[PDB]
């Protein structure tokens, strides 16, 4: 059984806490197969190389100049008390109302017990609609 997961945007996705986004893990298109989840982090149970990915749908009305949106995938390990940046985009997409989408994919090595989370600063620009526009997944390669 090769591990895989795809987590979707949900009603509680945007905590506003400065923490990572939360996701649906069971309903509609969301699923975990050989991965676990905890407070928005995917939790690795099988060591190996994973392609991780995330898309977030952004949008707003005008810019506040703070007009750069970062979207990123970050690793947590219990051996070091800080997160490690893995894959990150900066967009300034507001160049009235606007929509843009940010995608991230790549392969990283992950040990059992390590976790990956998704952060967007500023969180308020993420637009949830139906679970198909913002999401977070991975599978082992």
């Amino acid at each position: 059984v090769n591990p895989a997961a795809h987590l979707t945007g949900a009603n509680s996705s945007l905590t506003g806490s400065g923490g990572p986004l939360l996701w649906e893990t069971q309903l509609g298109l969301a699923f975990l197969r050989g991965l676990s989840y905890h407070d928005g982090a995917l939790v690795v149970t099988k060591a190996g190389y994973y392609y991780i990915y995330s898309k977030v749908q952004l949008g707003g009305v005008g810019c506040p100049l703070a007009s750069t949106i970062t979207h990123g995938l970050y690793k947590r390990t219990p051996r070091y008390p800080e997160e490690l940046e893995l894959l990150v985009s900066q967009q300034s997409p507001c160049g009235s109302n606007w929509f843009d989408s940010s995608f991230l994919g790549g392969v990283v090595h992950l040990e059992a017990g390590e976790e990956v989370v998704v952060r967007v600063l500023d969180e308020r620009l993420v637009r949830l609609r139906d679970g198909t526009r913002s999401y977070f997944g991975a599978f082992m390669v």
């Binding site: 309903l27 509609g28 949008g59 139906d130």
Partner: protein, 165 residues
């Protein structure tokens, strides 16, 4: 009543099973001697058509802070959203209803689908405020009041009369 093919597991005979109606899904397929068992869609799910799903579609639709439920998740229909009062729908966003400036007035109040509608104040009428409900109203009529004209009006300020004639 529409159908889906199946096969008895004991014998092997082809079966023509009945589909399930809106609000249900296939919980058990038909057999030689019993019809298809249609289950009711569980909370937060739905089926809106005749169908043979082994599970109901999820009510996946989320409503933002500026939206409310036009329709609830129901077994026969997904949830759906419209804009709250104060707001209308442009291009997947919920924008604030414009105000008409001074010199202009509301001809149609804004709705969930539609923004405030303003014309400029026609002659003999006015609006002095930015408002999203104030309409062009008619000028104080000094001759109808029997009073002397003091300062004439404009599209944005009311005519003024004295207090006598």
């Amino acid at each position: 009543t529409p159908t889906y093919p199946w096969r008895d597991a004991e014998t092997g005979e082809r079966l023509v099973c009945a589909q399930c109606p809106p609000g249900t899904f296939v919980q058990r397929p038909c057999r030689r001697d019993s019809p298809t068992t249609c289950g009711p869609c569980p909370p937060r799910h739905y089926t809106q058509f005749w169908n043979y799903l082994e599970r109901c579609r999820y009510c996946n639709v989320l409503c933002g802070e500026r939206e409310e439920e036009a329709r609830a998740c129901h077994a026969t229909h997904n949830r759906a959203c419209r804009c709250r009062t104060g707001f209308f729908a442009h291009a997947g966003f919920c924008l604030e209803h414009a105000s008409c400036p001074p010199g202009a007035g509301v001809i149609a109040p804004g709705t969930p689908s539609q923004n405030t509608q303003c014309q400029p104040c026609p002659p003999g009428t006015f609006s002095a405020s930015s408002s999203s409900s104030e309409q062009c109203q008619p000028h104080r009529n000094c001759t109808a009041l029997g009073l002397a004209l003091n300062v004439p009006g404009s599209s944005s300020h009311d005519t003024l009369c004295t207090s006598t004639g």
